Design a protein around this ligand. Structure first.
Ligand SMILES: *[C@@H]1O[C@H](CO)[C@@H](O[C@@H]2O[C@H](CO)[C@@H](O)[C@H](O)[C@H]2NC(C)=O)[C@H](O)[C@H]1NC(C)=O
Ligand SMILES: *[C@@H]1O[C@H](CO)[C@@H](O)[C@H](O)[C@H]1NC(C)=O
Ligand SMILES: [Zn+2]
Length: 379
């Protein structure tokens, strides 16, 4: 069929398209020593009072990138139990909001075999929920990450192109040295389809892939002992102490910083940090140590990585790069002082009553797959 061809650097030109033969080449062929080391901290799943205080402790308005702006993270938000006033405030503070589906269906075979329409209802539907109940009007909800990192073959990416999503961050790249830069899906993936029973795209799709490089979990990377990598931090099951986590962060930082400076992805679940105080303590110690010692390291959103790829800036130029200064150091007031607490039901979620907090008036129905606005209208 129309299998995407291997990367052709002649018809894949910035800013629409970026590829290299193995995914390790730096955009714009900048020297590695002049490339800012980007770090994309991300958090999956619901934003609510289970984790709102954790995010305040991390993103305290005192941790700043070398451009003077607050460090920024990306939230892949799933619908159930999410507080949309909190999503709105997180966005107001300059963090990126992306979608992680409505249902977070735990049947992994559903995702790997879902139709284009199924992917659309889950992901475009979740975008509708966020844009409405968090009142986000600037079309900045543009990223997708699938539950359980289940890639949806071509169907997922056909959906994302039809729905005008900017990027996916579901595809894992096996532990590699050097690690991989993001790539667009117009051309063949520069690495194997990785993971149990994974179905990866094969055709050309006008979608960016914020590829998830596995991290090296080896406690002593000096051997030649071989261990599978890990993409989600909490899937690195040998990390048991704060000291191990601290060394793990340094080792994988160095892997990126000392090679091709590919963006380093630190992909979290809030609960993993919250339930393990020594991990949170080690993480913050590490962040603060990296920020003080590096004038060339930026904690940025996923969209901000793509913006750099589209217009590569050296470390010196990065200080005044305007996309990285959007919502530089937001203070101000929340969109509403006391959000509505909506107790909602829906025949799509039979039995449950789910509280949804929003600055908007409560909808008549609990939003779900077949009614993402919660308006209860007939179709
Ligand atoms: C939902 O999230 C919002 C936003 O963080 C929380 O809103 C706070 O609500 C209290 C009410 O006691 C107000 O005093 C604050 O001004 C609000 N904060 C902001 C930043 O607007 C709300 O408490 C959350 N509710 C639940 C149930 O999770
Ligand atoms: C969304 O935010 C704008 C900007 O503050 C505000 O004027 C508008 O009323 C909000 N929309 C809704 C439906 O609350
Ligand atoms: Zn999830």
């Amino acid at each position: 069929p129309n299998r995407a061809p291997p990367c052709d650097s002649s018809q894949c030109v910035l800013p629409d398209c970026f590829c290299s033969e193995d995914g390790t080449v730096i955009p714009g062929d900048l020297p590695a020593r002049d490339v800012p080391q980007m770090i994309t901290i991300t958090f999956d799943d619901a934003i609510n009072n289970n984790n709102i205080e954790l995010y305040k402790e991390i993103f305290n308005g005192k941790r700043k990138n070398p451009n003077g702006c607050d460090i920024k993270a990306t939230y892949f938000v799933s619908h159930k139990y999410t507080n949309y006033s909190a999503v709105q405030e997180t966005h107001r503070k300059g963090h990126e909001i992306a979608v992680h589906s409505i249902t977070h269906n735990d049947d992994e075979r559903f995702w790997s075999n879902a139709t284009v329409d199924d992917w659309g209802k889950e992901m475009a539907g979740m975008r509708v929920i966020i844009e409405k109940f968090s009142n986000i009007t600037d079309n900045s909800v543009v990223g997708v990450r699938a539950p359980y990192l289940r890639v949806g073959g071509n169907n997922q990416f056909t959906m994302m192109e039809e729905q005008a999503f900017l990027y996916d961050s579901t595809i894992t790249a096996p532990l590699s040295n050097p690690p991989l830069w993001p790539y667009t899906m117009y051309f063949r993936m520069p690495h194997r389809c990785h993971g149990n029973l994974q179905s990866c795209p094969t055709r050309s799709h006008a979608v960016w892939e914020m590829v998830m490089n596995e991290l090296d979990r080896r406690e002593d990377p000096s051997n030649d002992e071989y261990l599978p990598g890990c993409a989600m931090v909490d899937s690195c099951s040998n990390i048991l102490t704060g000291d191990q986590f601290y060394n793990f962060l340094n080792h994988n930082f160095d892997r990126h910083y000392e090679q091709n400076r590919a963006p380093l992805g630190l992909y979290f679940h809030a609960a993993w940090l919250k339930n393990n105080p020594e991990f949170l303590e080690a993480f913050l110690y590490w962040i603060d140590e990296i920020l003080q010692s590096h004038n060339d390291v930026y904690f940025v959103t996923m969209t901000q990585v793509i913006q750099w790829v589209q217009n590569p800036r050296t470390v010196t130029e990065a200080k005044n790069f305007e996309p990285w200064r959007e919502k530089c150091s937001v203070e101000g007031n929340p969109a509403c002082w006391v959000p509505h607490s909506c107790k909602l039901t829906s025949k799509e979620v039979p039995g449950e009553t789910i509280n949804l907090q929003t600055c908007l008036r409560c909808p008549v129905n609990y939003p779900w797959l077949n009614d993402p606005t919660g308006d209860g209208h007939y179709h």
